[PDB]
Structure formats: C-alpha cells, structure tokens
Design a protein around this ligand. Sequence first.
Ligand SMILES: [Ca+2]
Ligand SMILES: [Ca+2]
Ligand SMILES: [Ca+2]
Ligand SMILES: [Ca+2]
Lengths: 26, 143
Amino acid sequence: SNAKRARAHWQLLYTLVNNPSLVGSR
Amino acid sequence: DQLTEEQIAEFKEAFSLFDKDGDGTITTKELGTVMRSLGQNPTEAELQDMINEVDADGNGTIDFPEFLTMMARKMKSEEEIREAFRVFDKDGNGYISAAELRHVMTNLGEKLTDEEVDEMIREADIDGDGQVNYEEFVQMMTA
Ligand SMILES: [Ca+2]
Ligand SMILES: [Ca+2]
Ligand SMILES: [Ca+2]
Ligand SMILES: [Ca+2]
C-alpha cells in the first residue's frame, strides 16, 4: 500500500458508504 | 443511495465502453485501447499511473466501484460529507480511529489488513494525532 493507494481506498469507502447497493456481488 | 438508479445504470454503460470483454474489470490494455481511439497516445507507464490513481485493492485493474472514483473526480455537496463522517466516527468524538475505520471496512465486506488501515490513517492524518478529524476527512474525500 502507498499514498496513492490510500487515497483511492478512502474514496472507494466513501462511495460504498453513500451507495449501499454497490456492496457485494450485485 | 446517493446516486440515482439512472445514474448507476448510466455509469455502468460508460464502464463497459472500457471493459469491452465484459469480465468486470478495466485493464491497462483496455484503457489504452479507448484512449487511442480518442486520438491520444499514452505510454504504458502513464496507463499504470491512471489505474493506480483509483486502484483501491491494488490488483492492477479498475472494477466498477473503483471506476466511480474516476467519475466522481471527473466533475464534482458538504452535507453528504458531514453525514458520511458520522458513519465512520461511531463514538461521536469527532475523530476516526483505526478501530472505527476497520469497523466500516468490515460492515462493507472489505477485506482488511493492519498495514492497509494504518497507511490510510497515516496519509489522512495531517495534524499527526493518530486519528482523522473532519477537516482531514474532507481533504481525503474531495481529493
Ligand atoms: Ca475487461
Ligand atoms: Ca482494483
Ligand atoms: Ca471516534
Ligand atoms: Ca489527525
């Protein structure tokens, strides 16, 4: 993991927190 | 959802413009193919940097939730940010701890390691207190 990877991961978690329908297979 | 159903459907269509083989991931070869069809000429290293900007699991390819990071950074909302901060900061003290970040990742079914969580806190932690406050959270989400 790196600083670019960290920021990408925070923003992914933000998308997933705001859009529960994107979690999981469907 | 923050995004409407029409939006998610639309962005899935955009994603499949790159994911031409429909396997659910965008590779540097797929990214390069689209970019050269639009008249560009990225190097293989520049294709890697583009994927690395949004690659959240480090597998070298872009899946659909990662693709939405490009879509959000493409063109841009401060009440959604406060509300999302509260989901992370579960004991309400205004600081996201490593344990509270792990809890968000667990609730989302994200696999986690200490190395990745400690790196995430470190990179966000501007003031050096070992946790992420609200203004540190804003800088991370909006950049
Ligand atoms: Ca593909
Ligand atoms: Ca990925
Ligand atoms: Ca807290
Ligand atoms: Ca801090």
